[PDB]
């Protein structure tokens, strides 16, 4: 069943790579809790990975036990493995997104968290609340 007292995150992307952003919202109310300023060059999967890790950091700072929902099986897998498996080339244009991803991985490797990371079931519950 759906846990309404939770944080839902999602990514907004264009091109491949292209401009990427993400946000986290309250699953019940739709209130926006955090938003990432558009990154000029990145991929959808990298954005989704960053969104989940930002959510983990957000909930940990606030001592919250609410779970996080993501509609990305890939990103959820990457976070649990503490390793983003993007195939995006590493060059000057992609340096910022890679730096953020590398730092998000480092955060996962150096912190613990109690947050369950759950799959949002789009087919049965409608679009994830944080959808763009």
From Swiss-Prot:
Transmembrane segments: none annotated. Binds 2 metal ions per subunit. Manganese or magnesium. The lineage of its organism: Bacteria, Bacillati, Bacillota, Bacilli, Bacillales. Its main location: cytoplasm. GO terms for biological process: DNA replication, removal of RNA primer. The chain holds residues 62 to 193 of 196 of the full protein. GO terms for molecular function: metal ion binding; nucleic acid binding; RNA-DNA hybrid ribonuclease activity. It catalyses: Endonucleolytic cleavage to 5'-phosphomonoester. Mg(2+) 2 binds at residues 10, 48, 71. GO terms for cellular component: cytoplasm. It is found in: Cytoplasm. The keyword Nuclease applies. Mg(2+) 1 binds at residues 10, 131. This is Ribonuclease H. Belongs to the RNase H family. Its EC number is 3.1.26.4. Endonuclease that specifically degrades the RNA of RNA-DNA hybrids. Its cofactor is Mn(2+); Mg(2+). Keywords: Cytoplasm, Endonuclease, Hydrolase, Magnesium, Manganese, Metal-binding, Nuclease. Residues 1-132 form the RNase H type-1 domain.
């Amino acid at each position: 069943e759906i846990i309404w007292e939770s944080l839902s995150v999602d990514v907004g992307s264009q091109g491949n790579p292209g401009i990427v952003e993400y946000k986290g919202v309250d699953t019940k109310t739709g209130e926006v809790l955090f938003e990432r300023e558009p990154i000029p060059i990145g991929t959808n999967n990298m954005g989704e990975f960053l969104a989940i890790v930002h959510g983990l950091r957000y909930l940990k700072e606030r001592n919250s036990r609410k779970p996080i929902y993501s509609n990305s099986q890939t990103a959820i897998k990457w976070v649990k493995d503490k390793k983003a498996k993007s195939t995006l080339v590493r060059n000057e244009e992609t340096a910022l997104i890679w730096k953020l991803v590398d730092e998000a991985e480092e955060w996962l490797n150096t912190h613990t968290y109690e947050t369950p990371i759950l799959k949002w079931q789009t087919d049965k519950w409608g679009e994830i609340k944080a959808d763009y």
